Nucleic acid binder design. Structure first.
Lengths: 55, 155, 60, 70, 141, 181, 71, 214, 76, 184, 98, 105, 144
RNA sequence: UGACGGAAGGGCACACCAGGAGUGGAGCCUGCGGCUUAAUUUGACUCAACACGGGAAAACUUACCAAGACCGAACAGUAGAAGGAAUGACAGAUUAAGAGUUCUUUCAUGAUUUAUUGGGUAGUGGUGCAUGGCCGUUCUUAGUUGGUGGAGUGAUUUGUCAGGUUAAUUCCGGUAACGAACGAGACUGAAACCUAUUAAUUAGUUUUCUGCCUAUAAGACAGAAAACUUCUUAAAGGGACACAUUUCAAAAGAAAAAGGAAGCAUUCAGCAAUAACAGGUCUGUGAUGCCCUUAGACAUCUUGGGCCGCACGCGCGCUACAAUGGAGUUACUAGAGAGUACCGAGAUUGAAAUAGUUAAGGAAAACUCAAAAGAACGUACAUGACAGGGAUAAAUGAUUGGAAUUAUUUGUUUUGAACGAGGAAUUCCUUGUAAUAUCGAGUCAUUAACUCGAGAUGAAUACGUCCCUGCCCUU
């Protein structure tokens, strides 16, 4: 129909099948510890999560 | 000052040499058809130079059963390995050869030197007896040939 | 046929980039002070070795 | 370029068997310099002279060989 | 029964926990005798405490050293501390102090590191360079 | 004379004829040197020997008291319960009294258990028997400078501790602050 | 948007929806696009509020009672 | 109909039965940072000014520290269930009033946001806010404003009062800051408000002696 | 190894108020500073206790300029 | 009576003729210098004038660990010197340590030039350059050459010992002095 | 036998419950096997400061900390420590294991 | 090392057994409908017949004997480059005969 | 350590129409042939029974006949098929047999077969570019 | 008042000196320019652009190109409209297509909406020369200010200095200034230690029993068992402050040595002020103003290609040019990491190798997780582009993937090029540091020569000076 072919590509592997939790971006992803908060968004919410700028 | 309790009191290369020809003398370790056409894995690019490389390897593998209670083929595979530097990349460690080590382990089971635990391989009673008999012969002549450093003259 | 000269005190460090030390040495064989330049680490108790003695290093 | 000779001929061997035991320091890489033979052969020769008791080993090792006159 | 003490020596990361016990005079590292240490050139370094104050001081002591850290040279520097410390500690718990002080004085006048650990450790890495202090090359034009 | 300490010798006692037990600021007890007893993690402020001449006690700055026996030479018991430092301890030989920077006087028993806690407004620098008399830094002796000992800073013209170098103990053996007992 | 009417009443009888249109909803099992266009097309009636947080849309029923009860 | 095949479940990683210690507290933080920002976009007219996610073994109790206050609480809880896939029986919400209204920067930033968007001059809007913050107990405060206050060319002014330590680890046990942006008919103005607390969060900064008199 | 004014001022105040308590021994001076003053940092207390002993050292030979304690005043 | 020997074969009963270096050379003044191995992990590079406390046989070993792909391999350098030190004994029938100290004295230039002008060279610089010059000569000679490094090092020390100009250390020494000789 | 494991991100929080549970083991209890301190886990993350590629390449270091303590009792499984939570401070997750 | 008639008149599953590793793995995996529908139309052209060129985006099909006679175009990036199948262009990929860039000038 | 006759020692050997130095050992002289390398050369020596430490110049003509036969007949001398340098070969046959001056001939008549088919790999061979897909922007900068 | 000086005075920094390693020269991996192309998408151009956008792109990413479709056209009025607004579709043809896209044919579903206007909306579109936020930089050094007061009509000046000192307007001291605030310091994380406390499993040691084996007097190994905490782990405390001696400068302090685990602020880092750039980012953001497009779309979707294209130039790097080495065998020895509703994979087993068939335990101090440089062995290699070097191509064997061609990665055999230590120039580095070689993590369906960390072997060279490059102060 008018929509059957829409999003017919199978995106399971993932470079564009994974998105940031808030920013929705596909570049800078941090999958460590299951954060899935892409870069430039984890730094803003780092202190809320609990990570501290220690050494 | 020295004393004998197990094979940890004889040099490993000296012991393996002694235990090598003993396996060859007994003639209970058959030679496979691929003894010469194969290297010891993938990192190497030449077959072993020693014609009797099976026996020296067999003694070395058998010694690792002595020290480590439950060992596996992959533990021998990573132990008998080298570094892969065939290209412009920096080298990185690789495993040895699966077949040549496992084939010898399957052979050492034939002569009862090793056993089959539920989680690996280990020696038997007579195999422990056989090795310790040889390791004493090396130990005996070792002390006669070279004096210990504790008795080394104070110079 | 060289002569030694013990170091008495270090006058300073000169030579654009400091790499030459001015030290007023004395000679044991002639008990006379001599001002010589040395290249390298030197201390107060050192004893030098000189192939000349009439060169009064002063650098104006 | 050096073409230091690889095998043993007659005149090469006899000259080797005379002055080699007479050197104060005998190492395979210096009898290769004077006798002008490949030092893979010098190892062969130095083992033979030892078996005939003309040189004595002060340091024989898997890294280097040093001998001297008897 | 079998009076014994415990000591330990450290290098960059090597730890050598000993057990200085009354015995015939046998020293063993991880089971192997002290004359079968893998880097044979360093063997004379490990036996160095024995000859410092005479081998007889260790004649009545059986030692059982265990090394589980660092490299093969660091392990060969921890054993030196382990052997030297074991003599000093034992010659205090079961011998008078002036003997321990005399023996410990001989080591200190010869090599102070024989009984005190080296404080140096591997430095941390910092961004912008391959190592702790080095930095990547700078391109100008 | 006498040699082998690594600090200021602070307490000296000769319980009996040639057994001298001394403590210093280097966490040690030397028996005169013949033997050294360890187990304390701070200064030895006072040491008291038993009447028998083979049991020993010693105060310390690690908020604890240790009881040694001079027959096996090891701390058979450690006294726990004090809060601050310990300045002094006195032996009476079944009751033990001690006090220090806690500003509290504790009456220990020979098995290691205290029984009461008399809680001077400031530190009690010395508790000694004759009834025990306790000397604090309050210029008082209840239970113009300080009181260091009973048997201060005022001098009655220099501090009294208990020429040479500053003497920290006396028993005349007189341990010093230059390891020069 | 052309949403099957057998499922339109499912939404009409708070609601959230991932902004990702690639995948189906986990509640009704229908695509995220259909849920988006229905509620967004209904927030313009001032019936709900379209707060969005961390790529997820939250819709809260309010005026909406008049429309929903009639529907 | 479409040929779609993926399903994006609205679950949370705090309710997973099996989870590593490394993956748990990390997923605990992400949930808090997500819930905290979520209701910030709902309780703006309230000024929630903080959230706690204290649990009771098997039940999660969310606390909202609203400065100025059950229909919404019933309403919000339903939102929490749908987004995070909570079971009904272990989720609840509570509202706590804060008395230190001047000491909560997140609530005061919205006061300046309200006044600026209303139309008040920026110096009049901030100045009255600083007066409220200072006497409430804070040691000092700074309000940083940058944007298009004057004209098309951007500008930024910093209002400072009281005492404020800028460097050291003391600025992590003491500081209280929140960043807000308010849209105007020309652009966006960014409002940063920092409040320096006092000894009520027990702890004294590095340099302090205050010897008692005797 | 110079000292800031945060320690030197704090070292003078304790001296002018608790002069009798202090002595020439650093180890005792540590515990008096902990008692007669409230410093939340162990390092800072040693630094003050370090300087106090130095100032009492200069006190014995003669008086100091900025230091004015009751004993000095009573003898003046 | 602890009497260490350099490899249980060589002793330390040697005399330094040049009294200028007699104090900056660590041979037998202190028991800490006499070591069975030139491998000591001491911190000789934390304070000025502390390298004078390193055993001189060890300082030679450290300088023999250069040019990149030999970085950090003290064990290789220790092996080379031990093999070399036996060879020097064969060539001279003397103590190899006693040969080495003479080489250091005779291979160290006593005059250099800085930007010219002729300036003198400190006693600590004389020892530094001496180990820096023989090591350079041995390393270059042994490169792409059949001889082993131990034999190359041994032949360098004997030649530079007494007066020989075939040694690379001597060649660069006379050249360095000659330029400064004319720069007075 | 029973096994109580507490884990938190704050050191003071886990140390409070371990001492409190042990202090609760004196009463209605038999013995209090001290807190066996398992090694700390550190969650290092090293991101890049800049939202773009411009500027000198400067990174920032982040790290959580997970302190873990294990408590072993004998007690009775039916009664154990009853609540065995006793108002755990938020960010502390106690467990009880058979 | 066989004859042309033998290769094209023997089962396909048998022929792939004498190909190389990559070609036989691509055949070992499932028959993708983008290829099954192509060959079905490929053998249809010769049914109702230089055959009729059939444009195709499939630059992935492994060449097989059943498509030897047919004439097929291949999409490079913009145009269906014409290639006639020959016996010599066996299990090499179908897209190796459609260059996707002008080499150099 | 014995004197070797001049006649025995040959400074060069003629095997499969190539010249091999006589000084190099047997396995390191058989490498001189364009079909054999080091893994192949060592196996052949062991299969022929020749000494591996013997010099090539000390080879009798009797053994060379065995060598030239075994290289030209590897399959019947129990050499594994995966050891061969030409397997599954087209134009009939599934054996290497490539130890000759035929190493270039087989290579050169590939490209002529590849080029005639107009395959992209063949075209890249014609133009003289990197064939196996490598970035040509900065490498292969031979002056032209 | 600031800026500037080829003006002076005093200080500082691997800035340079003494040196080490180098890069530049060869081959390759990779980024930028250029040329080509339909496209080779784009930002950034001295430090402060060029292994940078965490940018290791087969598809998606993706912003570019060739085709093809599509409404992600809300709401409101009108038409039309359950007597059907419209939507979905088999097969044949058109189409790469199993997109009913379209055409002859009918078959299902039904108000969810077709056509219209008013209109929003969407955009990796433009504009960082409209903004927020973040980051970099002036700037790793020591600097900045307002309350009152003194001087000047004023901009402003004083406080913020003569001298001495310190890593530091850090301090002693002189003082029309007094009293403060920020920056330094103080502070936080790691290393250096505790046979003293607390502890004991998932860490270790010891003891006892059972069985086995060799020694000549010790013990080794396996399977169970109970105490003990030196090592291990980690909490609380402790521990140095230059205190103390000598000397130098009534100060502030400075330099040996001794003690000590530790004595350059002990070291490595984190935080790090006022003011500023019209530095980068609207291509991280449902943060966003204005403009542009907005049914034949610059939104979205599908297929194919490109981002990898080579006549050349530059930058960051990997491997090398050998015997301080390469090849074959044998013994080894860390630390920090990471793991399941399929993730990390033990053990058995097919084989020449990558790998395949079965398959324990582990949500983890518990199971997986394992070192190589270096060492030792042999009458091996002998200075020969030689076995140094492994680019290039060739025949084949497999893995991951919907799909491997322009080789994703990789195994076997063969092929055996430059490169003989590299010109002008230039980069980094002061001690467990440089250097050498390796391990883990990020990215990861598949793919490290990259970056972030971690250990292992452990050098040389001064304890300096403004000469160069630049800083900070003073007429």
């Amino acid at each position: 129909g008018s929509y059957s072919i829409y999003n017919a590509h199978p995106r399971n592997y993932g470079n564009g099948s994974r998105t940031c939790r808030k920013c929705g971006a596909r570049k800078g992803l941090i999958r460590k510890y299951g954060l899935d908060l892409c870069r430039r968004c984890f730094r803003e919410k780092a202190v809320e999560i609990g990570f501290q700028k220690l050494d | 000052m020295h004393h004998f309790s197990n094979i940890k009191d004889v040099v490993a290369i000296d012991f393996i040499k002694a235990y090598a020809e003993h396996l060859k003398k007994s003639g209970k370790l058959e030679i496979p058809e691929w003894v010469d056409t194969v290297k010891t894995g993938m990192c190497k690019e030449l077959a072993p130079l020693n014609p009797d490389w099976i026996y020296i390897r067999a003694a070395a593998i058998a010694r690792k059963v002595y020290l480590n209670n439950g060992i596996g083929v992959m533990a021998l595979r990573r132990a008998y390995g080298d570094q892969y530097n065939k290209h412009y990349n920096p080298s990185h460690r690789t495993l040895g050869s699966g077949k040549v080590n496992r084939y010898i382990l399957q052979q050492l089971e034939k002569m009862g030197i090793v056993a089959k635990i539920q989680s690996g391989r280990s020696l038997t009673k007579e195999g422990r007896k056989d090795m310790d008999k040889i390791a004493f012969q090396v130990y005996k002549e070792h002390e006669a040939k070279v004096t210990p450093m504790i008795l080394m003259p104070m110079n | 046929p060289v002569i030694y000269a013990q170091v008495t005190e270090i006058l300073g460090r000169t030579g654009s980039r400091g790499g030459v030390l001015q030290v007023r040495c004395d000679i044991m064989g002639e008990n006379r002070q001599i001002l010589r330049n040395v290249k390298g680490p030197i201390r107060v108790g050192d004893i030098l070795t000189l192939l000349e003695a009439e060169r009064e290093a002063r650098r104006l | 370029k050096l073409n230091n000779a690889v095998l043993f001929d007659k005149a090469t061997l006899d000259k080797c068997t005379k002055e080699v035991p007479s050197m104060k320091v005998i190492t395979p890489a210096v009898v290769a310099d004077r006798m002008k033979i490949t030092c893979s052969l010098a190892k062969i020769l130095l083992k033979d002279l030892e078996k005939k008791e003309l040189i004595v080993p002060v340091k024989v090792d898997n890294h280097i060989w040093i001998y001297t006159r008897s | 029964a079998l009076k014994s003490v415990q000591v330990f020596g450290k290098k960059k990361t090597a730890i050598a926990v000993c057990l200085c016990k009354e015995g015939k005079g046998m020293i063993r590292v991880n089971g192997v005798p002290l004359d079968l240490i893998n880097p044979p050139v360093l063997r004379i370094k490990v036996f160095e405490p024995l000859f410092i104050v005479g081998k007889e001081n260790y004649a009545k002591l059986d030692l059982k050293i265990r090394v589980t850290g660092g490299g093969q040279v660091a392990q060969a520097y921890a054993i030196r501390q382990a052997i030297a410390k074991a003599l000093i500690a034992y010659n205090q718990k079961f011998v008078d102090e002036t003997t321990k002080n005399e023996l410990k004085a001989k080591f200190l006048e010869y090599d102070r590191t024989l009984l005190v650990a080296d404080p140096r450790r591997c430095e941390a890495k910092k961004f912008g360079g391959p190592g702790a202090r080095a930095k990547y090359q700078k391109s100008y034009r | 004379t006498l040699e082998g300490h690594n600090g200021a010798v602070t307490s000296i006692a000769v319980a009996k004829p040639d057994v001298l037990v001394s403590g210093s600021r280097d966490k040690t007890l030397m028996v005169w040197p013949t033997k050294s007893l360890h187990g304390h993690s701070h200064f030895i402020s006072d040491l008291v020997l038993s009447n028998d001449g083979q049991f020993a006690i010693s105060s310390s700055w690690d908020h604890t008291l240790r009881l040694w026996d001079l027959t096996k030479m090891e701390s058979v018991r450690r006294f726990v319960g004090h809060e601050g430092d310990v300045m002094s301890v006195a032996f009476s030989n079944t009751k033990i009294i001690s006090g220090g920077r806690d500003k509290t006087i504790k009456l220990w028993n020979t098995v290691g258990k205290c029984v009461a806690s008399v809680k001077h407004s400031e530190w009690v620098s010395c508790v000694r028997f004759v009834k025990f008399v306790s000397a604090g830094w309050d210029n008082q002796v209840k239970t113009t400078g300080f009181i260091n000992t009973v048997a201060g800073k005022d001098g009655n013209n220099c501090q009294v501790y208990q020429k040479t170098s500053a003497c920290m103990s006396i028993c005349i053996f007189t341990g010093h602050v230059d390891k020069k007992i | 948007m052309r949403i099957a009417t057998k499922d339109i009443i499912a939404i009409y009888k708070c609601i959230v929806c991932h902004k990702d249109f690639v995948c189906l909803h986990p509640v009704f099992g229908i695509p995220n696009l259909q849920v988006f266009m229905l509620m967004k097309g209904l927030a313009t009636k001032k019936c709900v509020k379209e707060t969005c947080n961390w790529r997820c849309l939250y819709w809260t029923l309010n005026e909406g009672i008049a429309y929903l009860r009639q529907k | 109909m479409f040929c779609l095949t993926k399903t994006k479940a609205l679950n949370v990683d705090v309710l997973k039965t099996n989870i590593s210690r490394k993956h748990k507290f990390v997923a605990d933080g992400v949930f808090y940072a997500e819930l905290n920002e979520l209701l910030q976009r709902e309780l703006s007219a309230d000024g929630y000014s903080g959230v706690e996610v204290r649990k009771n073994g098997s039940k999660f109790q969310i606390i909202i520290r609203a400065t100025r206050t059950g229909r919404r609480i019933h309403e919000l809880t339903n939102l929490l269930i749908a987004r995070f896939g909570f079971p009904k029986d272990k989720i609840e919400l509570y509202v706590e009033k804060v008395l230190a209204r001047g000491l909560c920067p997140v609530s005061q930033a919205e006061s300046i946001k309200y006044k600026i968007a209303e139309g008040l001059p920026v110096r009049r809007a901030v100045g009255s806010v600083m007066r409220l913050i200072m006497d409430s107990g804070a040691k000092g405060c700074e309000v940083s404003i940058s944007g298009k206050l004057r004209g098309q060319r951007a500008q930024g002014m910093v209002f400072k009062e009281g005492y404020m330590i800028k460097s050291g680890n003391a600025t992590r046990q003491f500081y209280s800051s929140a960043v807000r942006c308010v849209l105007l008919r020309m652009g966006i103005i960014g409002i940063k408000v920092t409040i320096m607390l006092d000894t009520d969060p027990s702890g004294k900064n590095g340099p302090a002696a205050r010897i008692p008199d005797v | 190894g110079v000292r800031t004014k945060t320690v030197k001022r704090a070292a003078r105040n304790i001296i002018e108020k608790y002069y009798p308590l202090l002595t020439l021994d650093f180890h005792t001076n540590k515990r008096v500073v902990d008692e007669v003053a409230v410093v939340e940092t162990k390092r800072l207390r040693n630094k003050i206790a370090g300087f106090i002993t130095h100032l009492m050292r200069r006190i014995q030979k003669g008086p100091v300029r900025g230091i004015s304690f009751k004993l000095q005043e009573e003898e003046r | 009576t602890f009497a260490p020997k350099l490899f249980n074969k060589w002793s330390y009963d040697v005399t330094v003729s040049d009294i200028s270096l007699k104090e900056l050379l660590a041979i037998n003044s202190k028991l800490k210098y006499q070591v069975f191995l030139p491998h000591t992990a001491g911190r000789y590079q934390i304070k000025p004038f502390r390298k004078i406390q390193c055993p001189i046989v060890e300082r030679l070993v450290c300088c023999m660990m250069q040019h990149g792909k030999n970085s950090g391999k003290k064990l290789l350098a220790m092996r080379v010197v031990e093999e070399s030190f036996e060879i020097i004994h064969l060539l001279t029938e003397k103590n190899p340590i006693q040969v080495l100290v003479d080489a250091i004295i005779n291979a160290s230039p006593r005059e250099d030039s800085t930007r010219r002008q002729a300036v003198d060279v400190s006693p600590l610089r004389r020892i530094n350059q001496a180990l820096y010059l023989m090591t350079m000569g041995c390393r270059s000679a042994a490169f792409r050459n059949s001889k082993t490094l131990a034999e190359c090092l041994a032949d360098e020390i004997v030649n530079a010992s007494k007066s020989n100009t075939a040694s690379f250390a001597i060649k660069k020494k006379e050249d360095m002095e000659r330029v400064a000789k004319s720069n007075r | 036998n029973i096994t109580i494991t507490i884990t938190s991100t704050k050191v003071k929080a886990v140390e409070s419950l371990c001492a409190e549970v042990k202090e609760n083991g004196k009463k209605k209890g038999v013995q209090v096997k001290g807190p066996v301190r398992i090694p700390t886990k550190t969650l290092r993350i090293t991101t890049r400061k800049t939202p773009c590629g411009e500027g000198s390449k400067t990174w920032d270091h982040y790290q959580m900390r997970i302190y873990k303590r294990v408590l072993s009792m004998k007690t009775t499984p039916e009664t154990v420590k009853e609540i065995t939570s006793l108002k755990v401070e938020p960010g502390v997750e106690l467990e009880v294991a058979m | 090392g066989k004859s042309l008639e033998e290769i094209t008149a023997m089962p396909e599953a048998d022929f792939v057994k004498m190909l190389d590793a990559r070609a036989r793995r691509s055949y070992r995996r499932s028959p993708k409908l983008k290829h099954e529908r192509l060959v079905k139309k490929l053998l249809k052209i010769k049914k109702a017949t230089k055959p009729k060129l059939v444009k195709t985006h499939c630059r992935d099909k492994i060449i097989l004997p059943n498509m030897i006679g047919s004439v097929i175009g291949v999409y490079n990036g913009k145009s269906f480059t014409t290639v006639e199948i020959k016996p010599e262009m066996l299990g090499h990929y179908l897209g190796e005969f459609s260059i996707t860039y002008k080499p150099v000038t | 350590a014995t004197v070797t006759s001049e006649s025995e020692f040959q400074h060069m050997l003629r095997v499969c129409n190539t010249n091999l130095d006589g000084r190099r050992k047997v396995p390191y002289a058989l490498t001189g042939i364009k079909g054999c390398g080091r893994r192949y050369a060592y196996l052949v020596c062991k299969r022929a029974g020749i000494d591996v430490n013997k010099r090539a110049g000390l080879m009798t003509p009797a053994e060379i006949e065995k060598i030239v036969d075994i290289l030209n007949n590897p399959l019947n001398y129990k050499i594994p098929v995966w050891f061969l340098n030409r397997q599954k070969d087209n134009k009939d046959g599934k054996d290497s047999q490539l130890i000759a001056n035929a190493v270039e001939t087989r290579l050169r008549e590939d490209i002529e077969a590849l080029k005639k088919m107009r395959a992209h790999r063949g075209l890249r061979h014609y133009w003289g570019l990197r064939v196996r897909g490598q970035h040509t922007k900065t490498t292969g900068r031979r002056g032209r």
